[PDB]
Amino acid sequence: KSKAHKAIELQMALQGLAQSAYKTEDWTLQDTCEELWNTEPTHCFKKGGQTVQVYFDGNKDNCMTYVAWDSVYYMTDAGTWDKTATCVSHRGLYYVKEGYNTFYIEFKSECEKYGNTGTWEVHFGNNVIDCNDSMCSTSDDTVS
Amino acid sequence: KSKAHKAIELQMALQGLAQSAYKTEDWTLQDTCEELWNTEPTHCFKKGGQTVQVYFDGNKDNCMTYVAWDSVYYMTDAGTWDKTATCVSHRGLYYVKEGYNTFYIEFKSECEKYGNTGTWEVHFGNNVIDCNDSMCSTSDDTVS
């Protein structure tokens, strides 16, 4: 099985996470399971899921939902674990990885799946995220 | 590597644990790591390590230390996870598995390693465990 390898990658990641600066934070069994590990953004740990609603075309129906993680844990090339927030823009969901915006969901490609108008509206909680800005948790390298 | 298989066993165990009645308890990265997983009692999860001191022969020196887990999580044949305490007797450390005392450290075999007198004294905290009794945490199937 190609999964036999997956369990191995996850284990090594957890070994690193266990020695990282975030080992003191609360980590549930769910936070560390394979299912989540293989969920976008992959190769990362994430906590604090937040619902992002996207409306394609000018219709409240046909409303797709996505999860924006309050905290995203990625590993630098050096192999060190950093913690950052998920950013929600009209373009999609991303996290800054070593200074660069990294998307794990592109709303344009998502609109090509549902929404002939090629138009979509992003809602995050009680805020409509259009413009060139975006919302994100306040999470940073600081340990919880 | 024979370890590649280990990571797999641990993962499946964690999948079961994640669905068990104890998934709500606090589980640290340490509690779920491979190193501990392969520590006695194996194939079990354990938390609340407690120091057990054993003195071989009539000497305070040559004092061996062992860990008695406040809570031992084993899986029944049916595959369900149960939680119980570690028992500290003069014979060794054990946990009751489906009504039967199960040792994961035998002090007699341990004395054969250090202590020609074939005699040993067991201390658990502020109590000397001789007689035919033993001390143990109050942990039971109840979730923390």
UniProtKB/Swiss-Prot annotation, chains A, B:
Residue numbers spanned by region Transactivation domain: 1-136
GO molecular-function terms, A-Z: DNA binding; DNA-binding transcription factor activity; nucleotide binding
Domain of life per record: Viruses
UniProt-annotated location(s): Host nucleus
Main location: host cell
UniProt KW Protease keyword: no
Gene Ontology BP annotations: DNA replication; DNA-templated transcription; regulation of DNA replication; viral DNA genome replication
UniProt keywords, alphabetically: Activator, DNA replication, DNA-binding, Early protein, Host nucleus, Isopeptide bond, Phosphoprotein, Repressor, Transcription, Transcription regulation, Ubl conjugation
A single GO cellular-component term on record: host cytoskeleton
Post-translational changes noted in the entry: Phosphorylated. Sumoylation plays a regulatory role in E2 transcriptional activity.
Subunit structure: Binds DNA as homodimer. Interacts with protein E1; this interaction greatly increases E1 DNA-binding activity. Interacts with protein L1; this interaction enhances E2-dependent replication and transcription activation. Interacts with protein L2; this interaction inhibits E2 transcriptional activity but not DNA replication function E2. Interacts with protein E7; this interaction inhibits E7 oncogenic activity. Interacts with host TAF1; this interaction modulates E2-dependent transcriptional regulation. Interacts with host BRD4; this interaction mediates E2 transcriptional activation function.
Family: Belongs to the papillomaviridae E2 protein family.
Protein name (Swiss-Prot/TrEMBL): Regulatory protein E2
Organismal lineage: Viruses, Monodnaviria, Shotokuvirae, Cossaviricota, Papovaviricetes
Full-sequence portion shown in this chain: 70 to 213 of 365
